[PDB]
Design a protein around this nucleic acid. Structure first.
Lengths: 96, 93
DNA sequence: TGTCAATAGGTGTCAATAC
DNA sequence: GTATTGACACCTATTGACA
């Protein structure tokens, strides 16, 4: 029933996230310090990062260099995908 | 050289710093290895890295940082591969 | 006086998987 | 949501073996 993402996460997950984001601690250090896999801490951080950008969880960040011709298309490629997602949340529940 | 620091992504201060000693300061490769405490094959790879960075990304290109669905994300990653590849032949030929 | 080449930990990410 | 391991890529390195 649409629970906002940052509200679903545990208090602990938000803590590990804070150590990495707010406090600049390394993910692997936080992982060892908390007896978790490093894969969990990376997955944890992505959850908070993705939701703070109003981004679907499955989306992957990409950092490439491109010609300005190709560059602008991928910048518009995002805006279109971003726009589509906003519309999808907007009318998918209504269209059914 | 200094107009490349944005393009040497995922590298280290010292790794770049040493590379400058060979390509800017013109020092000897084997001698910095003796100074900085490294083997010579190391400092060689560090040099080949920072050089191959330059001659693989034309400086007219733009840094794109972007959040995409997985399929499109790979497509943009594949796009860079093609663009980096066709640049190689124009530098090789 | 360096290069090629195999090799390897540390880290972060994607993937598949389980409860 | 909680969590695991397998794989890989891009780092940091080593030595062996040539030029």
């Amino acid at each position: 029933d649409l629970r906002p993402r940052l509200g679903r996460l545990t208090e602990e997950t938000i803590d590990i996230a804070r150590e990495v984001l707010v406090e600049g601690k390394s993910q692997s250090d936080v992982a060892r310090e908390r007896g978790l896999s490093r894969q969990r801490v990376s997955s944890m951080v992505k959850s908070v990062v993705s939701a703070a950008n109003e981004i679907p969880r499955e989306w992957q960040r990409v950092e490439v260099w491109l010609p300005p011709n190709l560059a602008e298309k991928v910048r518009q490629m995002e805006a279109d995908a971003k726009a589509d997602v906003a519309r999808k949340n907007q009318l998918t529940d209504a269209a059914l």
